């Protein structure tokens, strides 16, 4: 169940000759030497990407129905699920009377990217996407509203859909 | 002038020399870009531990109320030019920590942030491509054509 | 994705665009609703 | 013996940290939260509420955001009795409104009365 | 009530009643409650001024040898009169067992110290009064370890809010790091998710 | 006033107080302190520069998010002052060069652009503007800055009839040209001077009074059209001054009774008209009002001169204390 | 009202530990004044340290002055050794706040404060 | 079908404005005002209606899993047609 | 395993051990980057009889501590429990 670790004339000369010739130290650089030689990993950014997965938590994204109609219905799961209270909902009925948005924002500075809104919405509506390089250069550019959102998912949706039915079986 | 601007723009954008200042999860990453996977050595990036010899400083982790005069007075000792790169959520906005009594809601508080990288950690792959933006950013600089103009 | 083509949609983008921070294209927040509380616009005609 | 006598009122506004202006112009309140009319559930009027009033909260220059100024505005603590929050309530120097809890009043409920046969309480429709 | 429910160990719960009767019976100066939880752990409540004295007899009987410290903890319930409440938890590794010493205090009354007992409480209780205020008597180096230098205030009691009541930015007028008064930009949304109805009939308080 | 406008909130970083500025020039000193006074209120700022973005930089951290709005803008194109002044409410003016360069002369610096600022503004329906000016402003002075200046101010008032224009007479700090040029031209040698500057008189005044000053002329609808003259409460000679200077850097005084640094490709570090200015004597205006009628508080130099030079003193002398120099004699 | 003493008996002693507190802290403001470099003189520290003596006045219970004497040993000791920054010690001496209003007129025209 | 306000300024689908007096449209110069163009109620507006032979229909959105929770309109009016209460299509009867 | 067997030969001496034999780098080996789609196995309570949730709830089913000694013969002396068993060395690998 458990060990010892550290509990141990040719022997003596041996050890002096290690001593005054270094027979350690020639094979520690005869390890040197050999990861010398060998394929670097290096992989070629940003003309390679790194591996990923269908699952990654990426950059926020409103969906769409294949009809055109927005998919977020106003229920507030996501800023109640939500543990960093980045995402800010105000709703109203609209004008063919179904339950919609007006207002909602996404702090990226404040979301900590657990996909819990992913999850936790019952239309599929925001989706944590694949995107990762949204880096910017101003910090309000790092506070998305509806639009913004909107927008990241007509361009993401090519994709987005692709990974949620590769995905989807396992939830 | 605007070809001497194009050369020495193209010498400060080819060796950034960042520095070792990490806090937080966000540093380990920084490890991990650093690995041999992705090789910021390999940009002309070489870490460099004194603030007089560095470029660029990469604020990994959250700044605390006890950490603002220490990062206030780093970024201070760097010789001109200098540019700060915000990391992760805790040094853009607070992030996980935004409402607490002892965080600093975003680092641009204490020192002007050039760079907003976004993640919790941010890929490194994505910290590679906030420092290929932040070099695109020093390409495009106009000092000396501004000088000739002014 | 020569072989394996994405399903084609009334709303997907035409044409993709890269990163637009730090030009006049990028983008920039505001709010999306309108105004809460409605002020009470004097009359024009005069108290006489 | 090891002990001493101290016949004074407990006041430890001067060890809690607070600034002086969170706490002569604030006005707590101490009371028994009413139940919700939309559900039927009395669990959430057992135990008394200490909160205080409302500062301003106006919208913020970028999307409207609710900014506040006051700290306090979420503080809400819970007490198991009334004399306890008075106690606390006057231990950090806080000048407290007191609102008793309203108990109701034991009906005499009758399934017979819908079908009495000299009254004015039979139904008209079930 | 097999497969998704915890199993229940009686021989345990009676070896730790046991051993509370035990403890209760040797010292009856200062232990006034003995209690087991239904996940079969002990607890000891205490007076405060019999604090040292129950403790090493915990570190040092034959019967007991609780030779480790893991945690020292205060809890602020202001509903009673002595709204701290500081909770010991020691580790015996002849035996293979865990037990927790539970005691009260009120911000202005001292607790006699641990570090005598056990020197890991030498931070643990120190970071007590960085965190509650509780004064700890007889400390060695007694200081703040967590909070900032010219912080006020003990910010985990319940009644100190959530965002603090100063924060910092830089300041190109003096070329220092400032406080001012707190001003969100976004208020910290409060939300009520207690259910209104009731919880669990096994806990059922009785009335007024 | 419109609702967005509408002043709100304990005066914090955060809040709003219903102030939308175009500060023109702001990259300088003056602007920089105003930028930085005006971003802790929570006031709507709007900065055009002329020079790199990253000069502008350490403008960023003073304003909460979108409170400052960093805008492209020329000299000589109305177009961008339009842009820049279409929404603001009040306009200061604050641009202003001490030496000639290749394009800009001190007439295109002090009468043009003050000038199409005013008119652009008037134009645009800007309700406050201020402009500053010198308070030594002659049309008939020896330099061609106090001249430029009287013409500036001149076209101000008479394109812009409601413009507070406010002349600071020698304004000091942390990053400024003043004191520092005194402490600097001990460089060059044994300190050269005229006279030995015991004919001069000069009332030196606290950039952070100016600041505040400003700020309550932005405020104060009382202030419109007036001519305000922002005066240090202190007189002090020019001998007696650089002898304070020279006493508070723990630096030993040998002085002796300019164009020469002024045609290097960088920044000049003393010009002719450097030399006139420093010889000018400070006007006295008892009949304009000043910075006691704005409820500020005049900082005197025995407090703030060991502020500004702290930093040319070397490490022998760097663990003095405030109270151990004797002061300037006062006339 | 039976309560245990930490360090005071009275209040005697409690004035005496005060007292105490007061002579260490006018010992040791001139030397943060220089080994900080604080750009203020040695009579606003010492009268800033006599204005908090003074708004710490009005408390008759033992135990809290002898809490208030033990916050300020802790104070002490965190000023003596150089623990604390600039801007540490520069925090009491409020330099970037507005002067708030008081009169109720202009309380009334800034806003809704009681 | 974005409207344009004589501001300038192009319309959300939220119908929020910001007036020709609003100080914040200075926001927006130097840069854009980033809206989205495909408008939700102008593409379902075009999507036609269904007849279905029973009295009630079900309506999971399609994909099955993909979609909302699956409800159940009734059709027996004769007036108005059922129109899902998520996905917004709508249904009707052929008599 | 681009390289030259003289190469690869150098790498083994210098090493010490076959290094072509575990490679550090990944390959055609693994398994692929698109999978066919899983059919998810059911839980044990999802069933359709004698499946009512009041006999096999477990939040219902705790306890309040049980009070042994409350403040409102010769018992033999107790401990918390048996003394834990001395550890038996491991005859795998036990460095002796
Ligand atoms: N010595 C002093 O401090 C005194 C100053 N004043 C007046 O006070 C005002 C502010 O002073 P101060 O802060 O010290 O001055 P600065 O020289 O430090 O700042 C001048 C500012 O104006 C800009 N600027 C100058 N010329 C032009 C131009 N032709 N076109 C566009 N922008 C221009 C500069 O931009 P950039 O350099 O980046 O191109 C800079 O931001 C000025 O009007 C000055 O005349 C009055 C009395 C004494
Ligand atoms: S990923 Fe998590 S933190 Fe981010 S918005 Fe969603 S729920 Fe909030
Ligand atoms: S959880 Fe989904 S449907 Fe509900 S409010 Fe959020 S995005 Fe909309
Ligand atoms: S942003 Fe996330 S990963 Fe980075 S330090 Fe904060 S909590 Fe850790
Ligand atoms: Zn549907």
Redesign the interface.
């Known amino acids: 169940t458990y060990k010892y670790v550290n509990l141990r004339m040719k022997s003596v000369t041996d050890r002096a000759a290690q001593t005054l010739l270094w027979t350690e130290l020639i094979r520690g650089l005869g390890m040197t030497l050999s990861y010398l030689f060998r394929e670097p990993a290096t992989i070629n950014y940003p003309f390679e990407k790194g591996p990923l997965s269908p699952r990654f938590r990426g950059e926020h994204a409103l969906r769409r129905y294949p009809s055109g109609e927005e998919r977020c219905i106003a229920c507030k799961l996501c800023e109640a699920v939500c543990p960093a209270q980045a995402i800010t909902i105000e709703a109203e009925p609209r004008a063919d009377g179904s339950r919609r948005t007006t207002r909602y924002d996404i702090d990226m500075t404040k979301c900590i990217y657990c996909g819990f809104c992913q999850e936790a919405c019952p239309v599929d509506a925001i989706v944590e996407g694949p995107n990762f390089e949204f880096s910017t250069e101003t910090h309000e550019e790092l506070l998305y509203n509806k639009e913004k959102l909107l927008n990241n998912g007509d361009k993401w949706e090519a994709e987005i859909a692709a990974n949620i039915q590769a995905d989807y079986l396992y939830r | 002038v605007a070809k001497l601007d194009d050369l020495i723009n193209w010498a400060r954008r080819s060796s950034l020399w960042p520095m070792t200042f990490g806090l937080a999860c966000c540093a380990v990453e920084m490890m991990h870009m650093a690995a041999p996977r992705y090789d910021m050595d390999r940009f002309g990036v070489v870490f460099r531990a004194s603030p007089r010899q560095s470029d660029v400083m990469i604020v990994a982790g959250t700044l605390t109320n006890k950490m603002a005069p220490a990062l206030r007075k780093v970024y201070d000792q760097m010789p001109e030019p200098r540019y700060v790169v915000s990391m992760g959520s805790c040094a853009n906005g607070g992030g996980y920590y935004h409402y607490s009594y002892s965080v600093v809601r975003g680092c641009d508080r204490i020192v002007p942030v050039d760079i907003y990288v976004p993640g919790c950690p941010p890929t490194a792959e994505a910290l590679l491509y906030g420092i290929l933006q932040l070099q695109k950013k020093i390409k495009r600089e106009k000092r000396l054509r501004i000088w000739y103009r002014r | 994705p020569t072989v394996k083509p ?2 084609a ?5 035409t044409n ?2 890269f ?1 637009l ?2 030009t ?14 409605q ?1 009470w616009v004097p009359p024009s005609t005069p108290y006489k | 013996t090891q002990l001493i006598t101290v016949d004074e009122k407990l006041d430890i506004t001067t060890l809690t940290g607070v600034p002086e202006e969170h706490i002569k112009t604030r006005k707590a309140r101490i009371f028994v939260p009413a139940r919700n009319n939309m559900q039927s559930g009395v669990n959430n009027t057992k135990k008394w509420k200490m909160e205080f009033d409302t500062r301003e909260r106006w919208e913020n220059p970028l999307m409207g955001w609710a900014s506040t100024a006051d700290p306090l505005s979420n503080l809400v603590l819970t007490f198991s009795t009334k004399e306890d929050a008075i106690a606390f309530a006057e231990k950090n120097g806080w000048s407290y409104d007191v609102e008793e809890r309203k108990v109701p009043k034991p009906k005499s409920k009758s399934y017979g009365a819908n079908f009495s046969w000299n009254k004015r309480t039979r139904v008209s429709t079930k | 009530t097999r497969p998704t429910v915890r199993p229940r160990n009686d021989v345990a719960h009676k070896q730790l009643s046991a051993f509370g009767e035990y403890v209760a019976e040797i010292l009856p100066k200062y232990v006034q409650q003995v209690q087991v939880s239904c996940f079969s752990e002990l607890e000891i409540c205490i007076h405060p001024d019999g604090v040292i004295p129950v403790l090493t007899f915990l570190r040092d009987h034959s019967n007991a040898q609780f030779k480790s410290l893991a945690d020292l903890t205060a809890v602020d319930i202001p509903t009673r009169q002595n709204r701290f409440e500081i909770v010991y938890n020691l580790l015996s590794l002849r035996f293979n067992s865990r037990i927790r010493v539970k005691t009260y205090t009120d911000e202005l009354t001292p607790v006699e110290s641990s570090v005598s007992v056990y020197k890991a409480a030498n931070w643990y209780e120190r970071e007590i009064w960085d965190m509650f205020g509780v004064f700890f008597a007889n400390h060695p180096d007694l200081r703040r370890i967590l909070t900032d230098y010219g912080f006020e205030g003990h910010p985990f009691r319940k009644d100190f809010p959530l965002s603090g009541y100063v924060e910092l930015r830089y300041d190109d007028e003096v070329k220092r790091v400032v406080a001012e008064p707190v001003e969100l930009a976004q208020e910290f949304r409060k939300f009520d998710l207690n259910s209104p109805w009731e919880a669990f009939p096994a806990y059922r308080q009785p009335p007024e | 006033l419109h609702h967005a406008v509408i002043p709100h909130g304990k005066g914090g970083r955060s809040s709003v107080s219903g102030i939308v500025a175009t500060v023109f020039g702001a990259t300088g000193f003056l602007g920089r302190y105003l930028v930085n006074h005006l971003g802790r209120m929570g006031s709507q700022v709007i900065v055009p520069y002329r020079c790199e973005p990253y000069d502008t930089m350490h403008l960023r951290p003073m304003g909460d998010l979108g409170q400052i709005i960093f805008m492209d803008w020329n000299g000589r194109d109305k177009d961008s002052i339009r842009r820049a002044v279409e929404h603001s409410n009040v306009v200061i003016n604050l641009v202003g060069r001490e030496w000639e360069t290749k394009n800009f002369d001190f007439e295109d610096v002090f009468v043009k652009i003050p000038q199409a600022i005013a008119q652009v503004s008037k134009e645009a329906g800007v309700e406050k503007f201020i402009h500053i000016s010198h308070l030594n402003a002659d049309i008939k002075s020896s330099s061609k800055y106090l001249r430029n200046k009287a013409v500036g101010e001149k076209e101000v008032r008479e394109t812009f009839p409601e413009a507070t224009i406010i002349k600071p007479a020698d304004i000091f700090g942390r990053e400024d040209r003043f004191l520092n040029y005194f402490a600097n031209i001990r460089w060059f040698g044994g300190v050269p001077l005229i006279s030995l500057g015991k004919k001069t008189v000069k009332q030196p005044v606290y950039i952070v009074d100016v600041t505040k000053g400003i700020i309550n002329a932005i405020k104060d609808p009382d202030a419109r059209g007036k001519t305000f003259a922002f005066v240090g409460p202190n007189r002090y000679l020019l001998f007696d001054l650089v002898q304070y200077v020279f006493a508070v850097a723990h630096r030993p005084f040998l002085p002796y009774p300019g164009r020469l640094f002024e045609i290097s490709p960088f920044e000049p570090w003393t010009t002719r008209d450097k030399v006139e200015r420093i010889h000018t004597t400070d006007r006295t205006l008892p009949h304009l009002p000043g910075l006691e009628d704005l409820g500020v508080q005049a900082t005197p130099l025995e407090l703030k001169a060991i502020e500004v030079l702290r930093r040319h003193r070397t490490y022998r002398w760097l663990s003095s204390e405030i109270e151990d120099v004797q002061p300037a004699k006062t006339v | 009202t039976s309560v245990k003493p930490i360090f005071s008996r009275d209040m005697n002693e409690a004035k005496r530990r005060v007292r105490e507190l007061y002579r260490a802290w006018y010992r040791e403001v001139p030397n943060t004044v220089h080994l900080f470099q604080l750009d203020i003189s040695v009579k606003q520290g010492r009268d800033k340290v006599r204005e908090m003596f003074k708004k710490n006045a009005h408390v008759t219970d033992p135990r809290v002055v002898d809490l208030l004497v033990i916050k300020g040993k802790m104070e002490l000791e965190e000023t003596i050794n150089v623990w604390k920054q600039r801007t540490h010690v520069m925090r009491f001496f409020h330099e970037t706040e507005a002067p708030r209003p008081k009169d109720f007129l202009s309380k009334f025209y800034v806003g809704h404060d009681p | 079908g974005v409207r344009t306000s004589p501001t300038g300024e192009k319309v959300t689908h939220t119908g929020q404005v910001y007036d020709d007096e609003d100080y914040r449209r200075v926001r927006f110069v130097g840069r854009q005002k980033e809206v989205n163009e495909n408008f939700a109620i102008d593409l379902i507006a075009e999507q036609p209606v269904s007849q279905v032979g029973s009295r009630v229909i079900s309506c999971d959105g399609g994909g099955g899993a993909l979609g909302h929770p699956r409800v159940y309109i009734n059709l027996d009016k004769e007036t108005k047609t059922g129109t899902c209460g998520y996905c917004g299509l709508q249904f009707r009867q052929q008599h | 395993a681009s390289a030259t067997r003289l190469i690869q030969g150098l790498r083994n001496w210098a090493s010490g051990r076959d290094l072509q034999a575990k490679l550090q780098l990944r390959y055609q080996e693994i398994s692929k980057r698109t999978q066919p789609p899983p059919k998810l196995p059911v839980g044990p309570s999802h069933r359709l009889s004698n499946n009512y949730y009041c006999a096999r709830d477990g939040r219902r089913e705790a306890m309040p501590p049980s009070i042994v000694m409350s403040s409102q013969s010769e018992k033999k002396a107790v401990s918390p429990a048996p003394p834990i068993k001395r550890w038996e060395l491991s005859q795998d690998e036990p460095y002796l």
């Open positions: 994405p399903t949609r009334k709303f997907i983008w993709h665009k990163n921070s730090g006049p294209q990028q983008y920039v927040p505001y709010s999306t609703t309108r105004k809460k509380i002020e």
